[PDB]
Amino acid sequence: QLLVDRTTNQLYVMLPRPVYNLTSARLVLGNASNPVAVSEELNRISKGQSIGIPGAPYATPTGTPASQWTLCDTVAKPDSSAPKVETSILIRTLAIDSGVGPIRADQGMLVSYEGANWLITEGGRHSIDLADRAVTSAVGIPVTAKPTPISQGLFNALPNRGPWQLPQIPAAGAPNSVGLPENLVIGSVFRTASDPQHYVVLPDGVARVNNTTAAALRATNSYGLMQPPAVEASVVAKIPEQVYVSPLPDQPLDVLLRQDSPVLCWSWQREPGDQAPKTTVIAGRRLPLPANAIGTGIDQIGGDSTVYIEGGQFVRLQSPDPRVGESMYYIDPQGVRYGIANDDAAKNLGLAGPVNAPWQVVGLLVDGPVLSKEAALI
């Protein structure tokens, strides 16, 4: 039995005692108890000690589940001695437009993390050794390029999709044993007669190669071979086929500049059915949001993150590590993570149907206490 005080707004739970919060009183009774409007009936009677969790939220008001979970990285000015980064965690439906849209397939950005340069592309990130000057010239990074800083939260979210390093050619500099003209050396490139194709020379044949990789292969070695020589369409068939596993892209990459693109976001959207959440990479002038919501940034007490959440959430997280299972977490409207020990206890708060949220974004939220029946008595 729960009694709401008329003027103090204090809650008393009766079992065989006052309670800090409505969550604490609903957890202990084993049911989502609506409190009676009793004030002289408890103030004139016996009192006790304050039970319940203090760190827990007052109530658990879930709203419509959030469509997108997004990490946003904002760099006010790249041209600085040491630039500052502001992290925004948007747990709401995103607003896309001409100013802030998702990055194109042939588009990327340069970022510096822990004294290393990374190249944030469409689906992830790649380790670029900016000293590999010929490679950066083939990809499209200008000589006047400079990387900017990037958040740890955003860096972990962006999948590492391998470095942009040409694979070493084991018999480099050796003469062509395949029978191709003596000008062609092993570690060289050949062109052929709509769109022409480039081939790289290897010890046991030749392999096809995109323009970015052909450019970089010639610029890193050359071997005195000015311009790629032409080969017929037939002479290449007698020579065997090999596969160069070059990570470089086909079209040269347009490098976004932070002075034009001050916000870099990564976004996760749970999809229906057996689909895999759609992860998009977004860049722009501002945060991907409507103007009306620009003022509601909840600065996190215990974190360098500004939370733009809309209503409470009930979520389930599945980690790929087997030693880590799957966990339910309640997120209040302030954007604070509160773990839930079990299904029975989730039913005592009126929380049903936890939706899937990412570990990438939910891990960055401040972790408050756990909503267990056992943890109330303290």
Numbering used by the authors: 75 to 90, 96 to 117, 119 to 273, 276 to 460
What does the primary publication say about this deposited structure?
In order to gain further insight into the role of EccB1 within the ESX machinery we determined the crystal structure of the C-terminal domains of EccB1 from M. tuberculosis (EccB1mt) to 1.7 Å resolution and of the orthologous protein (MSMEG_0060; EccB1ms) from the nonpathogenic mycobacterial species M. smegmatis to 3.07 Å resolution. Both EccB1 structures contain a single elongated fold in the shape of a distorted propeller, which has an unanticipated quasi 2-fold symmetry. A structural comparison of the EccB1mt and EccB1ms structures shows that they are highly similar with an r.m.s.d. of 2.7 Å for the superposition of 381 amino acids (Dali Z-score 42.2); there is considerable variability in the conformation of the extensive unstructured loops connecting secondary structure elements which are, themselves, relatively well conserved Five domains are present in the structures including a core domain flanked by two repeat domains on either side. The central core domain consists of a 6 stranded β-sheet with 5 strands (β7-β19-β18-β5-β6) arranged in anti-parallel fashion with an additional strand (β21) parallel to strand β6 on the periphery of the sheet; the sheet is further stabilized by a disulfide bond between the two central strands (β5 and β18) of the sheet formed between Cys150 and Cys345 (EccB1mt) and Cys152 and Cys347 (EccB1ms). Therefore, it appears that R1 is the ancestral domain with R3 sharing more conserved features with R1 than do either R2 or R4. EccB1ms contains a corresponding set of repeats in the same arrangement as seen in EccB1mt: R1 (residues Q75–K127) is membrane proximal, R4 (residues G392–L447), the central core domain, R2 (residues Q187–P243), and R3 (residues G267–E323) which is distal to the membrane. ESX-1 is responsible for secretion of the important virulence factors EsxA and EsxB as well as other virulence-associated proteins (e.g., EspB, EspF, EspJ) that are secreted to the cell surface or extracellular milieu based on recognition of a conserved C-terminal signal sequence on the secretion substrates. These secreted factors have been linked to mycobacterial virulence through studies of the attenuated BCG strain of M. tuberculosis; in non-pathogenic Mycobacterium smegmatis the orthologous ESX-1 system is involved in conjugation.
